[PDB]
Design a binder for this molecule. Sequence first.
Ligand SMILES: O=C(O)[C@H](CCc1ccccc1)CC1(C(=O)N[C@@H](Cc2c[nH]c3ccccc23)C(=O)O)CCCC1
Ligand SMILES: [Ca+2]
Ligand SMILES: [Ca+2]
Ligand SMILES: [Ca+2]
Ligand SMILES: [Ca+2]
Ligand SMILES: [Zn+2]
Length: 316
Amino acid sequence: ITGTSTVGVGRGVLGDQKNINTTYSTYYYLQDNTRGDGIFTYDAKYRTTLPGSLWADADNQFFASYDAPAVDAHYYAGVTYDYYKNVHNRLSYDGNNAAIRSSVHYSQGYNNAFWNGSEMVYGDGDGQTFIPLSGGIDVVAHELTHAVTDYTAGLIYQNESGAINEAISDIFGTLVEFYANKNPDWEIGEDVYTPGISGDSLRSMSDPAKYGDPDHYSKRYTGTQDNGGVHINSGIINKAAYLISQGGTHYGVSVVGIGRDKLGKIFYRALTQYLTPTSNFSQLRAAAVQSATDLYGSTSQEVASVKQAFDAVGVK
Ligand SMILES: O=C(O)[C@H](CCc1ccccc1)CC1(C(=O)N[C@@H](Cc2c[nH]c3ccccc23)C(=O)O)CCCC1
Ligand SMILES: [Ca+2]
Ligand SMILES: [Ca+2]
Ligand SMILES: [Ca+2]
Ligand SMILES: [Ca+2]
Ligand SMILES: [Zn+2]
């Protein structure tokens, strides 16, 4: 829409109050004009037809429960845009300020979220397994990171390259969560998963095996489900990334941690300069060592920590 930029107030999925950027033109729309070419949030109205209607509201107050998922999808996309821009100098997902679009209320009881090659899409959850998926800042950032990858390395979504694609999204979704300082951890989707059970998540980066995912290359899933286990084998990369940042001894290999900023930056450079659609784990190791080299010098600790971490998980 064409209108006047304004600020509204609402409540997210978890009950927290936030300000959101809106546009005024008869109605108040979920259209944020302060970020690149815009952030836009749509109502899919429990249907599967995308994107749905641009979200319209009469009074600029989004306190209704049906409003919750839209508040969070809109707000978290902003934070994620901010992260890339401020931290990595990247303007939107394509590096050229593309508009960011999300739809909420997709389908009925849909326990998932996804990037469809053009926009983000969020289900409401069935109310037991998940609550509306846009309430998790790591989920929102994992999704927007698929768009970043699509525009950069272009990692094919299957087998090793697909598990690298997944680790990327979990790594950057976790860095966005620490960035916003919203109770940060090294778990994925804890805020929206099993509202009933406290303490769990979808996946663990710190200990992938907690939920049965591999944490060593020797334990790689070699079958065909999940596109050749893109959501499984990502645990091997995730654990490497956790060790680079935090440190530790894993399978007898000791890794000194270099912290999360440095982790973000080595991975961002590997992603944007070195990785290709068909990269495998072993190529991701060469890419990460080369980025850390570029950045900190050959005889650095940073380079050393990258090598140890990949040796710790069995990659090369
Ligand atoms: O982006 C992704 O990688 C996942 C998108 C998967 C998707 C792909 C194509 C069509 C529809 C859905 C969505 C997320 C994911 O990891 N989904 C997993 C785990 C999961 C979520 N809900 C589920 C319900 C059933 C089974 C698995 C799941 C999966 O689809 O495997 C990312 C973080 C939050 C949800
Ligand atoms: Ca209202
Ligand atoms: Ca958290
Ligand atoms: Ca998390
Ligand atoms: Ca839970
Ligand atoms: Zn994903």
